[PDB]
């Protein structure tokens, strides 16, 4: 299925993912397309952060859902 990740940097990333995919796994997909460390990534859905331990289906993330990627540069 297809999902959108709205980064705040002017790029809306289109990702092909599975409901079984894990966040850590989605953050990895982001890194491959946009070269951002997964430690710096914060994935948000419906206004709440997604834990690296869960799958997309744990948050009812369906096809053509929209995530928001916030960065944590420290």
């Amino acid at each position: 299925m297809q999902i959108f990740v709205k980064t705040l940097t002017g790029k809306t990333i289109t990702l092909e993912v599975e409901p079984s995919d894990t966040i850590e796994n989605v953050k990895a997909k982001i890194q491959d397309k946009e070269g951002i460390p997964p430690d710096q990534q914060r994935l948000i859905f419906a206004g709440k952060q997604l834990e690296d331990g869960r799958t997309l289906s744990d948050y009812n993330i369906q096809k053509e859902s929209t995530l928001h990627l916030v960065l944590r540069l420290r």
């Binding site: 959108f4 709205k6 705040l8 940097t9 002017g10 790029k11 809306t12």
Partner: protein, 315 residues
């Protein structure tokens, strides 16, 4: 190639980037803009809109060009549409914000006050009292888009755009209406039959499918069902006047919403810019734009999409 430039999305502006791709797929709207803009030869929205509308209508000048429409949002949100900073918005609302500024802009022009933009159409409101059979004199009102309630789904049958149009122009009985004729026979209140039909058609038809409804329970409900639209659309059925000119429209762009009733994302299906060899013929290669990302699309993909705003232009 035949790709168009993308649009930077900074802070939840897909509602704008999506609408601009759709607007820039309308040659007539750009032609009216270029003619209208000529009277000024930076808060002239028509000018700032034309700059981005023109760039999106031609192919990308550089490799994988990503344009920035921050100028448009900052002009509108100064006074006209003071929106919260990072708040998601309805692309259809922005369309009517862009229209009201063009109309206000046209009203303040000595040379062009008479020139209507190609999205301008007219509706007819017919009424007749049921108790006294006296017809009301036909009203005429302006529309810049047609907001069609999506009707109830039929069992197994797909929902068509023509079903929506027939539901919009359908007749209906309105209760508790004041009748002058009945009043003098006090203020009698009868029930009339009312019907909307299209009096004038625009060169640029903007259809708005109300994918956001209100449930019986009192909660916002988002209609996800596929509404089946055609590449070619005939509007003779929905006109007021019997006088038979053919009214055929051809699809230029489709604005699609992805999400629930509260938030989501907007993408656009649009045609490619015409070839340099024949720049007055509509291209057949369709494009898919998600803000900055621009990719080739099949006509089947376009028509299989959950349409929200359908942009048509008369042929």
């Amino acid at each position: 190639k035949g790709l168009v430039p993308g649009l930077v999305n900074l802070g939840n502006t897909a509602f704008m980037n999506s609408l601009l791709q759709g607007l820039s797929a309308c040659p007539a709207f750009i032609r009216w803009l270029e003619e209208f803009t000529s009277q000024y030869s930076h808060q002239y929205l028509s000018l700032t809109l034309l700059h981005l509308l023109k760039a999106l209508s031609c192919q990308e000048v550089t490799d994988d060009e990503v344009l920035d429409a921050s100028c448009l949002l900052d002009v509108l949100r100064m006074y006209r549409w003071q929106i919260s900073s990072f708040e998601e918005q309805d692309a259809h609302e922005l369309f009517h914000v862009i229209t009201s500024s063009l109309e206000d802009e046209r009203d303040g022009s000595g040379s062009h006050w008479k020139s209507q933009h190609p999205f301008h159409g007219r509706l007819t409101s017919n009424m007749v009292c049921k108790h006294c059979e006296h017809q009301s004199p036909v009203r005429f009102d302006t529309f810049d888009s047609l907001s069609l309630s999506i009707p109830a789904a039929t069992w197994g049958h797909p929902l068509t755009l023509d079903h929506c149009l027939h539901h919009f122009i359908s007749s209906e009985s309105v209760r508790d209406v004041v009748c002058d004729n009945c009043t003098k026979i006090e203020h009698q209140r009868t029930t009339f039959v009312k019907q909307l039909k299209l009096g004038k058609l625009p060169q640029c038809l903007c259809i708005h499918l109300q994918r956001l409804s209100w449930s019986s329970h009192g909660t916002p409900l988002k209609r996800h069902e596929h509404v089946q639209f055609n590449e070619d659309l005939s509007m003779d059925e929905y006109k007021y006047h019997s006088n038979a000119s053919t009214y055929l429209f051809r699809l230029m762009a489709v604005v699609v919403h992805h999400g629930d009733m509260h938030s989501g994302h907007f993408v656009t299906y649009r045609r490619s810019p015409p070839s340099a060899r024949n720049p007055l013929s509509t291209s057949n290669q369709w494009l898919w734009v998600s803000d900055d990302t621009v990719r080739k699309a099949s006509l089947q993909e376009v028509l299989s999409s959950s349409a929200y705003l359908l942009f048509y232009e008369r042929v």
